[PDB]
RNA sequence: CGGUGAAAUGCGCAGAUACCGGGAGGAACGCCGAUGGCGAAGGCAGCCACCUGGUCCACCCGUGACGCUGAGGCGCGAAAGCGUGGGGAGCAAACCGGAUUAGAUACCCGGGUAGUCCACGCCCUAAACGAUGCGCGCUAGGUCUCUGGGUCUCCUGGGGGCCGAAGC
Ligand SMILES: [Mg+2]
Ligand SMILES: [Mg+2]
Ligand SMILES: [Mg+2]
């Protein structure tokens with residue numbers, strides 16, 4: 001899985017200010033995690049079709065948040081993407 | 089209400105798959121896991137018990153099946 | 160999700176009345192409160208009062224009914240017999256002045272949103288202006 | 298990492314100097330696979346409900362260990378090679394569910 | 399012996415059936431098991447560990463409308479069925495034989511190949527059904543049940559059923 005300790009260090013990494021338990025950047029971050037983490041599982045388990053379902057949902061969600069941020073503050077969008085290497 | 093095995097017992101661990109002397113009492117004259125009707129167990133309890141007995145049988149302690157002796 | 164909150168308001172009142180509720184609360188909005196202000200004047204409701212549900216702005220609409228009746232069903236005549244949303248999102252309905260309609264031979268209301276306010280058909284036709292045709296009542 | 302409960306059943310007929318050597322080889326597999334032992338209960342032997350491996354008794358080991366997760370499966374089929382082991386069952390530790398009336 | 403309404407085909411003195419012990423093999427998991435649970439659907443029940451999705455409740459801490467729907471596209475998709483390879487206990491289309499019957503050329507009985515099983519790639523249909531698209535707000539209650547929380551007589555969420563106000 002992801003242990004609390006692991007995920008917390010992600011949070012603190014992207015946190016827009018001390019204590020931000022969940023801004024946009026943070027949500028994208030934590031979500032980006034869960035995706036790579038799950039995608040990797042799916043390279044091994046190509047038959048877990050059911051879990052793939054949740055992956056589309058996670059992915060699509062990640063897009064809508066970014067989509068929002070692109071419109072909102074296009075700079076924090078560049079930042080957040082580069083700082084995570086996405087859109088490809 | 090013939091006899092409820094919830095009452096004839098103190099408190100015990102339902103996840104304890106080694107406590108034969110307890111578990112023994114939730115089976116029939118055959119190895120069969122008693123119905124919740126005779127066990128008096130909760131809805132949640134019975135599912136837990138259910139797994140514990142299965143675990144314990146596989147360990148060799150409780151029987152899968154018996155043979156009915158006309159008593 | 161919620162898409163029309165004026166529909167939602169009207170429909171809140173409709174459903175309320177059919178059960179002879181004495182009153183129902185409706186999430187507030189400058190606009191809705193205008194429509195209510197109108198409904199008040201014209202006597203379809205006893206009035207609305209602005210209240211607070213869990214520190215959330217709301218509008219207590221206080222409904223009005225007929226008198227009890229004899230016969231084997233005594234549930235009062237409605238006062239708001241029929242309330243109905245006309246311009247809706249995903250088909251707006253704008254009316255020029257010489258196209259503002261008459262509701263029930265003069266007996267009902269059409270509530271209009273104009274650049275001069277939220278007006279009744281008569282109020283608007285008097286100020287010589289038209290606008291969005293919100294709902295009809297009677 | 299996670300904590301478990303290693304069960305092992307051995308045949309009852311091992312003389313002391315033979316049973317002692319399966320207890321060590323167990324303890325060296327444990328040793329080997331990161332499995333830090335927290336506590337042990339040798340219940341000795343009970344009479345089974347059915348003939349495991351043709352004999353009506355079985356010798357019982359228990360071990361509340363602390364493996365790292367992803368190696369538990371190795372440990373087991375590594376424990377289970379030893380011929381005098383009749384059954385191994387490792388199991389995740391969980392808080393007791395209490396019931397009465 | 400088996401087998402049916404009765405019976406034959408079949409199997410049996412190369413010793414069957416019934417009984418005890420040994421071994422191999424495949425496929426499905428009795429009791430729990432519910433009128434229960436989970437899943438978007440198709441669907442999912444021995445046990446264990448690993449990897450993994452959805453989801454509910456409490457706290458009311460963070461973001462600050464970021465939301466809903468969705469032509470085409472893309473993925474999932476029972477059973478049967480196709481290609482290659484492996485597997486084959488039981489079952490069993492076709493086919494073989496026994497009976498029945500006016501005639502069976504079916505329903506009944508004895509066999510039996512595909513198939514049913516695993517992997518990989520296809521097929522993409524269904525009474526794929528709640529024959530009820532998704533999302534949100536509003537409109538009496540009673541009762542049974544699975545599952546959270548509380549100051550747990552009762553209160554308060556989320557499911558699953560039955561009965562019913564208004565209405566339809
Ligand atoms: Mg015009
Ligand atoms: Mg035999
Ligand atoms: Mg064979």
Ligand SMILES: [Mg+2]
Nearest residue numbers: 436437438557
């Ligand atoms: Mg469901």
Ligand SMILES: [Mg+2]
Nearest residue numbers: 440441526527
């Ligand atoms: Mg179904």
Ligand SMILES: [Mg+2]
Nearest residue numbers: 458459460461
């Ligand atoms: Mg807050």
Ligand SMILES: [Mg+2]
Nearest residue numbers: 023024461462
């Ligand atoms: Mg702000």
Ligand SMILES: [Mg+2]
Nearest residue numbers: 023460461462
């Ligand atoms: Mg703020």
Ligand SMILES: [Mg+2]
Nearest residue numbers: 057060061466
């Ligand atoms: Mg969506």
Ligand SMILES: [Mg+2]
Nearest residue numbers: 060467468532
């Ligand atoms: Mg959609």
Ligand SMILES: [Mg+2]
Nearest residue numbers: 475476521522
């Ligand atoms: Mg298919």
Ligand SMILES: [Mg+2]
Nearest residue numbers: 477478479514
């Ligand atoms: Mg198939």
Ligand SMILES: [Mg+2]
Nearest residue numbers: 479480481513
């Ligand atoms: Mg094939």
Ligand SMILES: [Mg+2]
Nearest residue numbers: 482483484485
């Ligand atoms: Mg083949």
Ligand SMILES: [Mg+2]
Nearest residue numbers: 494495502503
């Ligand atoms: Mg024939």
Ligand SMILES: [Mg+2]
Nearest residue numbers: 490507508509
């Ligand atoms: Mg046949």
Ligand SMILES: [Mg+2]
Nearest residue numbers: 489490509510
């Ligand atoms: Mg056959």
Ligand SMILES: [Mg+2]
Nearest residue numbers: 455456555556
């Ligand atoms: Mg809530």
Ligand SMILES: [Mg+2]
Nearest residue numbers: 545546554555
């Ligand atoms: Mg409850």
